[PDB]
Amino acid sequence: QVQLVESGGALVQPGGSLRLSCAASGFPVNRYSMRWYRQAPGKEREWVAGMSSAGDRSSYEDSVKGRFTISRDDARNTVYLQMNSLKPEDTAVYYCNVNVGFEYWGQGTQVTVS
Amino acid sequence: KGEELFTGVVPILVELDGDVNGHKFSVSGEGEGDATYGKLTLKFICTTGKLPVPWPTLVTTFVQCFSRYPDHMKRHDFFKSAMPEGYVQERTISFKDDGNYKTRAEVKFEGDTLVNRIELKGIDFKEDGNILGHKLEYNYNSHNVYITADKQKNGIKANFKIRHNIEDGSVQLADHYQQNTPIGDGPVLLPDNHYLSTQSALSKDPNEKRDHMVLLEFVTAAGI
Numbered sequence: 647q648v649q650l651v652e653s654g655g656a657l658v659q660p661g662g663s664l665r666l667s668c669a670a671s672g673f674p675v676n677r678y679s680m681r682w683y684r685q686a687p688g689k690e691r692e693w694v695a696g697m698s699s700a701g702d703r704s705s706y707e708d709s710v711k712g713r714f715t716i717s718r719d720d721a722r723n724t725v726y727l728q729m730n731s732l733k734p735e736d737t738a739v740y741y742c743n744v745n746v747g748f749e750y751w752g753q754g755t756q757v758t759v760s
Numbered sequence: 761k762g763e764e765l766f767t768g769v770v771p772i773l774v775e776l777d778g779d780v781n782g783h784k785f786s787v788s789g790e791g792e793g794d795a796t797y798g799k800l801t802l803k804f805i806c807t808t809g810k811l812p813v814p815w816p817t818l819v820t821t822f823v824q825c826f827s828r829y830p831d832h833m834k835r836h837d838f839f840k841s842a843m844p845e846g847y848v849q850e851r852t853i854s855f856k857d858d859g860n861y862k863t864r865a866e867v868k869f870e871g872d873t874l875v876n877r878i879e880l881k882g883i884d885f886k887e888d889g890n891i892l893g894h895k896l897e898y899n900y901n902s903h904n905v906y907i908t909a910d911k912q913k914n915g916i917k918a919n920f921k922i923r924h925n926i927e928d929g930s931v932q933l934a935d936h937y938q939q940n941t942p943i944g945d946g947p948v949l950l951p952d953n954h955y956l957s958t959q960s961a962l963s964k965d966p967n968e969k970r971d972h973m974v975l976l977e978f979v980t981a982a983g984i
Contacts, residue, residue: 679897679929696929705930716929745899745925747961 798828
């Protein structure tokens, strides 16, 4: 019953903007920290961003600092990744992530920056 | 041979002596493992007061012989084939942008129980970092432990990355470098390249007053 579902992936031109969504079921998004990772083909799945359980702190990997913003709507139990200044290097499958007893991943959404 | 010691539920005992940035501590653990299911249930207790570091940084250190190897991979299970005499497990664990642990352990049967006895030394930990700062969340992620044969030492090596969830929403990597050596001189299985897929859940004992951790873990060999 813990489930995560990402959406929003799409083709986007470099410089463009895009927002991804992570819909959570089975647990309250405001009681657990949540995170985005991405994985480009060939490369390893790296951590992209995260938010504390309380909501008071956000963190990013250096390569996306100042270009991505993580936020959440507690009422809609959803987490978002706002992306700006998209680089072709940002092309990847994006995943959200939470740990509720064990770790859970969503199925991922494809973002292509071309 | 060694594999037949694991067809059922086996009692486990864990003992660790540690020193991190000069703070010394001790931990004792007990539980049981059931390799049929790749399942482990352990409870640890800091016998020396409060734990100097976050409980999760110590999970990998606190018995891969309880991994479920599937039928078609039984021949790749180094861990069980070294039993009952056991093996030495050594690691360097390097925390990204912070200190490292070096650990040395013996894993072997003592009578009817599987025992894991460890020495750990930690250095170079930043007093305001995620570890000594106690900034890790009390949970544990799921990883792949990549195993390879080390013919020169009649054992195996492993390499993997532990992702520790940090309270501020970030992730603290712990790079694991691992070497296992049989204790007996008899034959052991040297496996083809493969990995172990692990999942762990941390919890608390509501009636435990001491500093402690409860661990439930599932480990399954794969990749062949």
